[PDB]
Amino acid sequence: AQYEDGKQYTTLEKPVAGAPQVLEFFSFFCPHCYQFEEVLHISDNVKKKLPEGVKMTKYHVNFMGGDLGKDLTQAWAVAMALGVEDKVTVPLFEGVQKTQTIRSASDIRDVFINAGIKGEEYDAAWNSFVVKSLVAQQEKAAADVQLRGVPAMFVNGKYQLNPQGMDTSNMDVFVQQYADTVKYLSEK
């Protein structure tokens, strides 16, 4: 066929029931994730080709950057709770990987303060049990799929994108091929 298991994707031998339709994992420590977000805008271009009625989920993982990685998973939980994903994603990436000004929870917090979230509001979210189960969710979802590397995308708990198997000579072509694949997987 044109889309083959082992080529543009792989199939999980143990499928994950009740999984988000389109589930994406990343880490602010992950260099390819930085590319996926800042240069390629993968999440966005995928959304642009998805059907109607399909929900797009993105979770952070712990297994990169030790203590700060875990902190960053709680902060993404806060970001999700407050709905400020789009106002912190870029400064978080650039503070971890570009400028290297993120070294502690407190620096993570500064990014939110600078993005206009109120101190009070952030600290309350950070400590809320609405944030704890959102952290738990992020962990559960990764655990459910044997996650050992990012970036990673899963479709209907059953298919995992394989970007390694797509051409990378042209960035735009890589993205559309990536997105078209998710669409195909989506319809399968």
3-state SS, 16-45, equals CCCCCCEEEEECCCCHHHHHHHHHCCHHHH
Question: In CATH, what number is assigned to the domain containing residue 127?
Answer: 3.40.30.10
Q: In 3D, which of 184, 165, 163, 186 has the Cα closest to residue 175? A: 163
- Which pair of structure tokens corresponds to residue 12? 């999980």
Cα dist. 44→24, 55, 120, 126 in Å? 12, 12, 31, 27
- Helix 105-114 and helix 85-93, axial crossing angle in degrees, nearest 10: 130
Query: For the chain, what is the domain count?
Result: 1
Beta-bridge partners for 59: 25
Residue at token pair 């902060």: 75
Specify whether the CB–CB gap between 5 and 161 falls below 8 A: no
Q: What's the resolution in A? A: 2.3
- Rg from Cα positions in the chain: 17
Specify the experimental method. X-ray
Domain of residue 49, residue span: 1-188
Q: Cα separation of 30 and 61, whole Å?
A: 10
DSSP 2-16: -S-BTTTEEE-SS--
Rounded distance between C-alpha atoms, residue 41 and residue 43, angstroms: 6
With beta carbons less than 8 A apart as the criterion, state whether 131 and 78 touch. yes
Q: How many Å apart are CA 64 and CA 72, to the nearest integer?
A: 10
Listing from the earlier edge strand, what are the strands of the sheet with 159-161? 9-11, 159-161, 152-155, 22-26, 56-60
* Cα–Cα distance measured from residue 103 to residue 139, given in angstroms and rounded to the nearest whole number: 22
CA dihedral 34, 37, 39, 44 (to 10 degrees): 170
Phi-psi sector, 72: left (phi>0), alpha (psi -120 to 50), beta: alpha
CA angle 164, 174, 145 (to 5 degrees): 45
Of the candidates 111, 71, 67, the one whose C-alpha atom is nearest the C-alpha of residue 88 is: 111
